[PDB]
Amino acid sequence: QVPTRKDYGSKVSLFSHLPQYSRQNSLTQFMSIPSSVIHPAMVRLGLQYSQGLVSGSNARCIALLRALQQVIQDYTTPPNEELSRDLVNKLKPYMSFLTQCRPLSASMHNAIKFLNKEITSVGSSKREEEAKSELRAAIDRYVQEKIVLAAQAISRFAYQKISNGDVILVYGCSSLVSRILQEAWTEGRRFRVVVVDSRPWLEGRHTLRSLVHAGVPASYLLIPAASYVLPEVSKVLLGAHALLANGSVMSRVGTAQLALVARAHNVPVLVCCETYKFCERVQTDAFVSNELDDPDDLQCKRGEHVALANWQNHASLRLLNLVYDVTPPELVDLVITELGMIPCSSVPVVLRVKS
């Protein structure tokens, strides 16, 4: 049986319903070196999630789907059994272990749902090798037409909204935004880009390193100084990790703050995302369901001391570093998908048309 991960540190009272794991503690200590309970692809993928080697939502979904393809190729049905439900029953513990390594995201949840619906739809008369080949082809087709073509269409649509000489503000690291900016610059547009980052991931330096390599003029600053630069900003472009049915945008921690400050400065806000990230569940805030990262990441060596070195030694001291937060629909103007540019409140409609 797969052991459970132990919580590290004392959690905030409001977040007692969420887990909090340390990066040092990995489940592999209590697993057989030749993987028997779970497939080696599953344990490798969980290891490279729990260690933070894969961060982007698209990257996480792609890696999960590739590992699932590996498992499907390696799968063999048992006698007196059929693939249709045995495959799902075998897959469930793998998803549980993956959640144990790190909580699932919207992209992975949608991918799991789609794969379950595809496997359940596999006819009983199908042959094992033919069924495996069909599942592999379906996964490849889903990846292609739900990431690559979606990104191309989104970039083409967003090209129109970008005019010459304007200033565009981005936030964090996101493949879709970087691709949009690079393709817009390549097509002939001339503009500056303002990059906003935040502690402790500091993932913005990712996309910045891309923009400099594309020749795009750029500017860099931390999130608190955004109010200083928003007067000269014309458009705001953000990446969304999830779109909720009520129009709320479930994204990185600083997204809602930047949207609020931009709205206060009277600057339009743009959001580009793929349809496969549209969830059906809703949440009104960032407290009911969120993610607690490693609290030790908050420590920063300023001067010659780390002010939060032995933070556990203070009984009444708690550390809190969310990973996600929710932006209300009123602070958003666009949702840019392969379907086109739609209002932020049209998310449920798409949810209906994709089924």
Binding site: L149, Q152, A153, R156, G188, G340
Partner: protein, 190 residues
């Protein structure tokens, strides 16, 4: 996205023929039309206005939505091209000295189907698109159709200015008409 809708998709192959497949759905890129033929603007942009001298479009990287005789409202200022008489005269002449390398151009190899294309007894119908598009692809050196069209137009302009043929009198309203006129004139020369 009405400008992005498609009816027939041009499938290409590389003796450099072009087919049409039934494709009744919106395309990922804007499409222009010319003589019942559809060209996906996969690497260019759409144009506007009734400006003459079609070269002025792709010089900006754009390409007009529609033009040519099939368009009742051609935006490239249609004009006469008073050279199709010799095209009809030589239409029934088949493939079999100076004339060989005279008509090797503009393709660089002898070719006679151009006269049949420019012949009067050849209606610009829906069934003729295949041979027209295949010829325009073969006579160009690219993969997407719009680069083939622009290559054709600039090669026509190059050959016209080679003999000093009043490039102003050659806009590109009906590409194959200029093809036939140049072939007839250079066959008259040799």
């Amino acid at each position: 996205m009405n400008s992005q809708y498609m009816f027939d998709y041009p499938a290409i192959n590389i003796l450099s023929s072009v087919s049409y497949v039934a494709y009744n759905k919106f395309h990922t890129h804007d499409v222009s039309t010319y003589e019942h033929c559809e060209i996906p603007l996969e690497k260019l942009r759409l144009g506007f206005g009734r400006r003459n001298s079609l070269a002025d479009f792709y010089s900006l990287g754009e390409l007009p939505a529609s033009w040519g005789p099939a368009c009742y409202f051609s935006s490239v200022k249609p004009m006469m091209y008073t050279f199709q008489g010799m095209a009809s005269d030589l239409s029934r002449f088949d493939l079999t000295p100076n004339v060989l390398k005279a008509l090797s151009w503009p393709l660089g190899i002898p070719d006679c189907e151009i006269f049949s294309i420019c012949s009067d007894r050849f209606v610009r119908g829906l069934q003729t698109r295949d041979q027209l598009m295949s010829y325009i692809l073969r006579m160009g050196d690219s993969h997407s159709l719009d680069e083939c069209i622009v290559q054709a137009h600039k090669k026509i302009l190059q050959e016209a200015r080679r003999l000093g043929l009043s490039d102003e009198h050659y806009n590109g309203y009906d590409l194959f008409r200029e093809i036939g006129s140049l072939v007839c004139l250079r066959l008259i020369n040799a």
